[PDB]
Scaffold this active site. Structure first.
Site, PDB file in Angstrom:
ATOM      1  N   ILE A   1      40.269  13.452  35.428  1.00 27.45           N
ATOM      2  CA  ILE A   1      39.453  14.473  36.088  1.00 27.45           C
ATOM      3  C   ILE A   1      39.332  14.241  37.595  1.00 27.45           C
ATOM      4  O   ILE A   1      38.952  15.153  38.339  1.00 27.45           O
ATOM      5  CB  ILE A   1      38.074  14.642  35.399  1.00 27.45           C
ATOM      6  CG1 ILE A   1      37.212  13.384  35.564  1.00 27.45           C
ATOM      7  CG2 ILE A   1      38.233  15.070  33.898  1.00 27.45           C
ATOM      8  CD1 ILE A   1      35.787  13.559  35.247  1.00 27.45           C
TER       9      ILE A   1
ATOM     10  N   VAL B   1      38.991   8.499  37.395  1.00 28.10           N
ATOM     11  CA  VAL B   1      37.971   8.974  36.478  1.00 28.10           C
ATOM     12  C   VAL B   1      38.625   9.849  35.424  1.00 28.10           C
ATOM     13  O   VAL B   1      39.406  10.759  35.746  1.00 28.10           O
ATOM     14  CB  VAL B   1      36.777   9.691  37.167  1.00 28.10           C
ATOM     15  CG1 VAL B   1      35.663   9.983  36.150  1.00 28.10           C
ATOM     16  CG2 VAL B   1      36.220   8.851  38.321  1.00 28.10           C
TER      17      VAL B   1
ATOM     18  N   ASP C   1      25.799   8.264  50.178  1.00 23.29           N
ATOM     19  CA  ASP C   1      26.684   9.422  50.176  1.00 23.29           C
ATOM     20  C   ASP C   1      26.084  10.569  49.402  1.00 23.29           C
ATOM     21  O   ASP C   1      26.778  11.274  48.672  1.00 23.29           O
ATOM     22  CB  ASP C   1      28.117   9.061  49.692  1.00 23.29           C
ATOM     23  CG  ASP C   1      29.178  10.087  50.113  1.00 23.29           C
ATOM     24  OD1 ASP C   1      28.891  10.920  51.016  1.00 23.29           O
ATOM     25  OD2 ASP C   1      30.284  10.050  49.559  1.00 23.29           O
TER      26      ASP C   1
HETATM   27  C1  LIG Z   1      32.628   7.249  35.141  1.00 27.42           C
HETATM   28  C2  LIG Z   1      31.880   6.910  36.377  1.00 27.42           C
HETATM   29  C3  LIG Z   1      31.601   5.553  36.615  1.00 27.42           C
HETATM   30  C4  LIG Z   1      30.825   5.153  37.707  1.00 27.42           C
HETATM   31  C5  LIG Z   1      30.316   6.123  38.586  1.00 27.42           C
HETATM   32  N1  LIG Z   1      29.420   5.657  39.595  1.00 27.42           N
HETATM   33  C6  LIG Z   1      28.353   6.360  40.146  1.00 27.42           C
HETATM   34  O1  LIG Z   1      28.074   7.529  39.854  1.00 27.42           O
HETATM   35  C7  LIG Z   1      27.560   5.581  41.143  1.00 27.42           C
HETATM   36  C8  LIG Z   1      28.063   4.421  41.792  1.00 27.42           C
HETATM   37  C9  LIG Z   1      27.221   3.677  42.648  1.00 27.42           C
HETATM   38  C10 LIG Z   1      25.892   4.091  42.862  1.00 27.42           C
HETATM   39  C11 LIG Z   1      25.416   5.261  42.221  1.00 27.42           C
HETATM   40  C12 LIG Z   1      23.991   5.776  42.422  1.00 27.42           C
HETATM   41  F1  LIG Z   1      23.898   7.123  42.453  1.00 27.42           F
HETATM   42  F2  LIG Z   1      23.131   5.394  41.469  1.00 27.42           F
HETATM   43  F3  LIG Z   1      23.445   5.389  43.591  1.00 27.42           F
HETATM   44  C13 LIG Z   1      26.235   6.007  41.367  1.00 27.42           C
HETATM   45  C14 LIG Z   1      30.604   7.496  38.402  1.00 27.42           C
HETATM   46  C15 LIG Z   1      31.379   7.900  37.304  1.00 27.42           C
HETATM   47  C16 LIG Z   1      31.663   9.332  37.202  1.00 27.42           C
HETATM   48  C17 LIG Z   1      31.058  10.110  36.185  1.00 27.42           C
HETATM   49  C18 LIG Z   1      31.355  11.498  36.071  1.00 27.42           C
HETATM   50  C19 LIG Z   1      32.256  12.048  37.001  1.00 27.42           C
HETATM   51  C20 LIG Z   1      32.834  11.249  38.031  1.00 27.42           C
HETATM   52  C21 LIG Z   1      32.545   9.891  38.148  1.00 27.42           C
HETATM   53  N2  LIG Z   1      33.694  12.062  38.792  1.00 27.42           N
HETATM   54  C22 LIG Z   1      33.689  13.367  38.271  1.00 27.42           C
HETATM   55  O2  LIG Z   1      34.356  14.315  38.706  1.00 27.42           O
HETATM   56  N3  LIG Z   1      32.788  13.358  37.158  1.00 27.42           N
HETATM   57  C23 LIG Z   1      32.438  14.514  36.335  1.00 27.42           C
END
Ligand SMILES: Cc1ccc(NC(=O)c2cccc(C(F)(F)F)c2)cc1-c1ccc2c(c1)[nH]c(=O)n2C
Length: 257
Positions: A18, A26, A131
């Site tokens: 995705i 991801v 971000d």
């Molecule tokens: C699978 C996955 C693993 C880790 C992260 N890590 C974070 O979210 C994050 C990292 C550091 C700090 C913080 C916070 F916010 F806590 F500070 C959040 C995001 C995704 C993720 C999930 C859904 C998704 C995606 C990625 N991309 C996409 O299109 N979809 C629809």
């Protein structure tokens, strides 16, 4: 006393790619149902890739709140992977700027309230997002805000001290980014749409010559929301309110509708 974060070996499967995220790719996957899986493509990670994984797990594992993307677990075998809940829906950016979804004022104010709730939670845990933007705000079942870090397409949300550059990141730079999200919700637009030059935007926001045009807010936008937006967007970081105060302002103006 343990959280059992490490997912047992040979359980996660990945399907559709995705996107890309921080250290890897991801995918939509499966682990006790639909999940999102961020996985490092190689089997042998460099010490830096491993460190970036450990730091991301360390942050995510401290979060348990309805407005934060649910961290489920991690795996290091055969590959570094972080597992989160799968959200059905679209990001706030996709809604406002791609498919141009028309939300009612009550719903726009509620999306702002839920984002402030999630941000207040992260800040209380001393997590600076760094971000925050509408593409990092997911509308799960197009009702519940889930803040994550899904991904330079971030300059529009950058506080002037972050643009200028040291460590310019603080709770106040996250508040500024929230101010821009508030602008997006209340105008349905990205700021600086009549400037086609990225260098000029960077330079002028950093010098304080340029700031979002608040007269672009919808007519049905409450006056207290416009004032909150102005406070979150203050060029001087010390003048910006923090999320407990932002939260109290949103809650109040939502009751007064
Ligand atoms: C699978 C996955 C693993 C880790 C992260 N890590 C974070 O979210 C994050 C990292 C550091 C700090 C913080 C916070 F916010 F806590 F500070 C959040 C995001 C995704 C993720 C999930 C859904 C998704 C995606 C990625 N991309 C996409 O299109 N979809 C629809």
């Amino acid at each position: 006393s343990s959280d059992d974060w490490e997912i047992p070996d040979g359980q996660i499967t990945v399907g559709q790619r995705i996107g890309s995220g921080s250290f890897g790719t991801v995918y939509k996957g499966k682990w006790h149902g639909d999940v999102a899986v961020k996985m490092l493509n190689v089997t042998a990670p460099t010490p830096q890739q491993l460190q970036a994984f450990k730091n991301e797990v360390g942050v995510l594992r401290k979060t348990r709140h309805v407005n934060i993307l649910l961290f489920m677990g991690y795996s290091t075998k055969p590959q570094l992977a972080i597992v989160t809940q799968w959200c059905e829906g679209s990001s706030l950016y996709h809604h406002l700027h791609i498919i141009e979804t028309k939300f009612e004022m009550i719903k726009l104010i509620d999306i702002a309230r839920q984002t402030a709730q999630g941000m207040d939670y992260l800040h209380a845990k001393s997590i600076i997002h760094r971000d925050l933007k509408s593409n990092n705000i997911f509308l799960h079942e197009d009702l519940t805000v889930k803040i994550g870090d899904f991904g330079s397409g971030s300059i529009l949300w950058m506080a002037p001290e972050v643009i200028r550059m040291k460590n310019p990141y603080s709770f106040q730079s996250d508040v500024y980014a929230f101010g821009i999200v508030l602008y997006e919700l209340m105008t349905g637009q990205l700021p600086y749409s009549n400037i086609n030059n990225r260098d000029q935007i960077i330079f002028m926001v950093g010098r304080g010559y340029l700031s979002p045009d608040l007269s672009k807010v919808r007519s049905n936008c409450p006056k207290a929301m416009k004032r909150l937006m102005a406070e979150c967007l203050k060029k001087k970081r010390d003048e910006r309110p923090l999320f407990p105060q932002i939260l109290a302002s949103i809650e109040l103006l939502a009751r007064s509708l």
